[PDB]
Ligand binder design. Sequence first.
Ligand SMILES: C[S@@+](CC[C@H](N)C(=O)[O-])C[C@H]1O[C@@H](n2cnc3c(N)ncnc32)[C@H](O)[C@@H]1O
Ligand SMILES: [Mg+2]
Lengths: 1181, 117, 117
Amino acid sequence: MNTNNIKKYAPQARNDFRDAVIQKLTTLGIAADKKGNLQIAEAETIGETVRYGQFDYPLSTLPRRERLVKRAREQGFEVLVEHCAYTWFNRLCAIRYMELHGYLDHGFRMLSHPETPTAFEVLDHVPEVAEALLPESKAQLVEMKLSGNQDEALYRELLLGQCHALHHAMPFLFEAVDDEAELLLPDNLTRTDSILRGLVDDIPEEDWEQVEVIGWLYQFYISEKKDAVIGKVVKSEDIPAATQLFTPNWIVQYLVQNSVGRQWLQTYPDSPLKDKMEYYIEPAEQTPEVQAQLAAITPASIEPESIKVLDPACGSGHILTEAYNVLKAIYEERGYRTRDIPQLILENNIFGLDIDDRAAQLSGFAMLMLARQDDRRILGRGVRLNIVSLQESKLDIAEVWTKLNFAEYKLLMRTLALFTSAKTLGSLIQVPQEDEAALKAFLERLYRLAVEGDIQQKEAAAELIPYIQQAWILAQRYDAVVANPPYMGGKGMNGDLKEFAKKQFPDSKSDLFAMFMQHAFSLLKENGFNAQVNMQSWMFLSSYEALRGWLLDNKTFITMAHLGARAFGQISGEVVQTTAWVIKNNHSGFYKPVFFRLVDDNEEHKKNNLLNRMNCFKNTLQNDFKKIPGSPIAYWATLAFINSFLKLPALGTRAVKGLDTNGSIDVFLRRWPEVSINSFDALGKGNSKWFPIAKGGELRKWFGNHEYIINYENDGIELRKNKANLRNKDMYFQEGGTWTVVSTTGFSMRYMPKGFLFDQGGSAVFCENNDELSIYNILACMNSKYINYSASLICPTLNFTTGDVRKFPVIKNNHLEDLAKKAIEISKADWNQFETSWEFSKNKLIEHKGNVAYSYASYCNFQDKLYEQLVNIEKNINNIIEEILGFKIETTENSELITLNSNKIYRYGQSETNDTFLNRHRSDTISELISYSVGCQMGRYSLDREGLVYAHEGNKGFAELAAEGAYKTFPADNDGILPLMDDEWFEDDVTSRVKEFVRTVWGEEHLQENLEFIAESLCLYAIKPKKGESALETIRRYLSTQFWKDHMKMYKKRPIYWLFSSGKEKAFECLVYLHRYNDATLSRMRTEYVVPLLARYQANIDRLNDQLDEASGGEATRLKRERDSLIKKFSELRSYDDRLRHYADMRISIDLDDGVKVNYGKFGDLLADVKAITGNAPEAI
Amino acid sequence: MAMSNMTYNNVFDHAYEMLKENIRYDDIRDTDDLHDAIHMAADNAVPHYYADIFSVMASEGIDLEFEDSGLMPDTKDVIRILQARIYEQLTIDLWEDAEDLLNEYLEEVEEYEEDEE
Amino acid sequence: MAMSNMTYNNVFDHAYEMLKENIRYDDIRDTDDLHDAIHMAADNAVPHYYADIFSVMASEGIDLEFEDSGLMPDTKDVIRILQARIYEQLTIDLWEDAEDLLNEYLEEVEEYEEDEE
Ligand SMILES: C[S@@+](CC[C@H](N)C(=O)[O-])C[C@H]1O[C@@H](n2cnc3c(N)ncnc32)[C@H](O)[C@@H]1O
Ligand SMILES: [Mg+2]
């Protein structure tokens, strides 16, 4: 709640200040329309006053209004508004902070009054404050107090007198002579609805005790605009508003204490400064050679006045405070008067730069406050701070460089052309070193002329000081650079900014913090330190490979802390991972850095772990990072792994990319079940239009994921008309390996036979014509712990690309081939036991003989045998590899996962619920058996031959096939329509034929036992048990309730058997085979399935209603309930018959070459779940 | 609370006791006049706690499909539909065995004429 | 058998993971394509066991009243209505926070584009 007050107050204060300033501007005579063009009204001089619009001023504001107008035209209206608003806000906050601590001379509160709310303590002791601030008018002010009125005028006069007094102390914030801001100050400052009330009483009193309130004010003042301008291309004016943040203190201490204190302790090894700093990290150990080199390069003595610190992005000024503390400690240790230290520190030890004026003002105020915290004679003596903000240099005034005077002109014209665009680039500009002394001398001359001289010279010097000052600051060499670079990627790509980035920073053009890193290195001196904190994505990416290559052969690492995620107080940044590091500017290849790993913790835990110095890795040289391909900074690896990585060959150009259609995949891609098998190329040769394609899906090893086809007729003329790359044309239709590019769990490779195409998502590997290696050996190597660990280490993002895979190691052996072949055979046998594969042959349960229970037990035993055999096989591959290279690899994540459908954990989840898993498996098996029975009834399969029997189009050629004798044990239906109701009226009832199927397969003696077993098995998981019912009733209930849903789930919303339903009440339901539908199908349905049903309903209603009227009884209401539903069924069936008769007149012809999704919506509201499949509501007639 | 173990058997027993009390209080002496009694017995038997309803629906003895389409409420709430289903199931189960109580009451009250004295 | 303990939080976590898998596999690049990616993510999230469905509705995080009258099935089975309610709640919750994953994937693919090479 402490920061909640500031969070709730700051944006409202900003809005209120902006409203006040825009209202004052509009009253003055300046306004902007919706479009944005200025509305500068014409000034009228009636006489002795002015006539801006309908307002008057005493003729003394004309030059100031002209200056405001000329500022409005040369830049943005909103820019001026924002500048004035935050200037006044900062001035008021500074006054409040200074008066709460009692730093004012007169010792009276200005904005408040103790123990009396809504009161001021300056309206009673008027003479004292008047003589302290404005003596000459003192007496006159007293007269005002005697008037009993003009209180607001007196308060306004007194308040403006404080700023003029404070101008001398801090010129960067207050002005003495008349300025424009005085015209923008709001009126009625002493009323109950003024703007000062919020600042005075909305914030608590104890929040001003510390000095960290400045950072909160800096951060929370711009939050709304930051949130508004994030999701677009940020322009130059909004750059500061999008990259402003606050930094926690312990990180700053860690950065500062290891860059300045390290140098001081290197010069003097036994200084008493060691115990003052708690985040200092000692060197581990060094070889004699590097020790001798370091001793040779180390200087002997250093004086405190020759230490330079630069902050390229000041912001709030948090780093400079810590630098001040350390330098004060050093000065005290050396021996100096305690009253002379802050002056020297602020004079010749601290420098800074920024792009915004608000940050400069806040940083200067914070530095001055910290200095005054330990001194009193300060603030009364003229002290210059070298903290400035960059500004444009588009001004070449005739008066300057002509009237200013009384060789250098060449220097001035050379240095003034570098800042033609400085509000966009910032601190990335470079100034030659050789122009340092001349710039210093010119700046000294300008300082001298700023006091002695006429008005013209003084004005010219005041105009020219900032450019020379910033050039001199930027053209100097430092020995410590500490910064927190702003973050901005490919969205904030202004044309000029990105053109400059690509022209000047080719190796780090992908972001901004990398450019800041390179420029900071270029801005340093010999034997200097560079300490920073930035984001993690520069050590484990291929886009920064050149940067890492250039960094590892010219600099030396000293210390690094790997913070990870959830740092920065959890202020958003859920996908922001950060690191902190210190790097020296010299070169030494045999140096041992010190690393910390704080990735998995919380902020307090991370701070405590760093304070106690846990999780330390200091057993790796610096050259060893070059042995791993790509040169990633992996500090947690071991020496044996790195050394062994270079003893084996790597894959060459065997890895290639797949094709890529530019779009519209809904017209080229289909699933295999929904097309005719004559056109399928995999089976049924003679005419090929669809070919199998590999795209890559979930995790699976050695075989599987065969569920798509693509249209590639005539070598591709429909696909070639569209803009498709079709990469690697000559490598198609060959066997090899395949792997998924963008995964989420791990790395795996699968075997790919002939007659396949590979896509961009799933890429392929092909062996050479006569290569020494074999594809089976490669498959064996790629599915081991070694390769999995290496792939996890190299690319943590799990985005394995062809360039990444082109450098994996390979091992040559002989047993690996046969082991891989056995594993492939096992996986294929596991995959080919379901209906959703075009190599499905026969159901497993009907192979055995006896009872259903015996077959189920044998099936379970077979699955367990496969699982155990594969588990045993996978062990020898790992055992053999670990003998080639003499070390062992730890097991983590899913390195011990068997990807088979025989393993229940893989196909049901990680949860251990074996009690429910032993029932779910049984229910699923029985459901699959029933589905196979229905398929046999329809005609897709048969009990005589194996595989698909009929899957052509239009029900043509079926008569000849049936007459040949394909179905003789279990005949198939002739019409192709299966009724599904709750009576035995029809001879095609599904339950009767299911019973016939069971009787035929498993004999006659134990028919009842088998039916009881099936009925018991269904009720475990699929449906809810009932009180008393037979097996046939349960079968019928399952068929009518939960068969459509299971079928629709199995085929993934691409049904093969289409369901025709009457509606809410089950008056009429039927199943139709998609591959046996022609234009004369609905006519048969209406003619000989609906009309007899209507006649039966009429007869039953007439018969039943007759007997109840004749004879009644106490429990005769049951017959009434039975008769009630028949009327509703009859009416619904009549309506459905009318609709079906309307739809059947037009002979609809369907085309299987188009998808199920398109064709499912041509029958109106005659089908079921049209919206769940097509995606849009059915259209009514 | 949430961990409520209420079954359909308890509801049926409570409804049966209420029906017996109602038939004893009202003194109905005809077979076709039991509709009001069974309606009253079934109305004041369904629970109101949502946890109890969800525990009853998962118990043994009650199915999950309506038999009459006219008893479906027309609303956007789901508690009402479950309550209607429970009410219909109770009505059917109680109307299954209702003549025994009536004839037992009649034969018991026949033995208290006292010859109109 | 008839006893289970599944909460709405497990269903939501499963739906979140499946949504991430779908957006990764299908390479979604625009907001309007998210709809289907969400829809499928809901489809493989509603349990089919009646005990699990009844236990979910008694957990914390899901209301007991429909918001849109156009998502109520016209059937006589009570399982469909509960499944539709769960589907609607999951759809609303997932669409509430979905742009984060999309923009994260977009910025990652922009980072590893490698100048379209
Ligand atoms: C994230 S803030 C860091 C503030 C400060 N280092 C701290 O921790 O309190 C980054 C600052 O860099 C400044 N900045 C942004 N772009 C800049 C540029 N191109 N050149 C110089 N400074 C820039 C912004 O004004 C912003 O305040
Ligand atoms: Mg038929």
